[PDB]
Every structure is written in C-alpha cells, then in structure tokens.
With several copies, the nearest count.
Chain A
Amino acid sequence: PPVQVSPLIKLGRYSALFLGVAYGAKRYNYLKPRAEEERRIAAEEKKKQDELKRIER
C-alpha cells in the first residue's frame, strides 16, 4: 500500500538527482585532461629512470 509523498520531499529529490548528474558529467570533463597529462609526463619520467639504470646500473 503506497503512501503518498509529503510533496516537499518529492520535490527535493529529483532536482538534486539531476544536479548530481550534471555535477558528474562536469567533473568527468574537467578532470580527464589533467590526469592524462600528469600520467604521460610521469611516463616520460619513468622512461628516463629506465635509461638511467641502463647507463647507471
């Protein structure tokens, strides 16, 4: 036997839902490049360390 929403909450819910959906898409977009670049430059660093131990074994 469903119990009708005290409408305050039925309002408060789905709004916040879509707020969070937007927040998530925004975070994804805003964050991808920084991590991509930090990791790629760390890859430069690790290749350099590899060649270091190659010449400084």
Chain B
Amino acid sequence: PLKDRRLLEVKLGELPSWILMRDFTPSGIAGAFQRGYYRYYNKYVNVKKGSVAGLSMVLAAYVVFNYCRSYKELKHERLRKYH
C-alpha cells in the first residue's frame, strides 16, 4: 500500500524500486546522518537513567574506525608469515 518503506520491509525483487524511489542529493545525506544520530540519541541517551551503553558504543566505534585507518602500517609485523 506504499511506495517507500523501510529498506527491511521492501523485497529483493522490488529492491531496485526502493533504490530508485529514494533520493541521493547531499541534502538527503545530511537528512540521513541526522536521522541516525537522533535515533541513537532519543533511544539510548535522552532517557532519565541513561547508562554506560548509552555512550560506550560510540567510543568502541571510533576505536574500530581508527583501527581500520591503520591497517596498512600493520601488515609489516605479523608474527607468522603464512596465515
């Protein structure tokens, strides 16, 4: 009953239908990053008894980010050659 649905709702056959019904302009990129931040915020943070997990996630994410950034310079000391 709807053209645009949550990408999980849509099927594989109409997969490209979803890919083409949606927009791509940078404004529609900010209007996505914002939605992500605000889902996280209003679901795990803006609550009267926020916990560690309300924060630890972004930290342990930034961690993996800056690990991926560094992969190149770390292929030079693998303790074993044939992995």
Contact = CB atoms under 8 A, between A and B. Distances in A.
Interface of A: 31, 35
B65 interface: no
Interface residues of B, number: 2
B62 interface: no
Interface of B: 81-82
* Dominant SS among interface residues on chain A: helix
Contacts of A35: 81-82
A35 B81 CA distance: 10
A34 to B, nearest CB: 9
Nearest to A27: B82
A31 B82 CA distance: 9
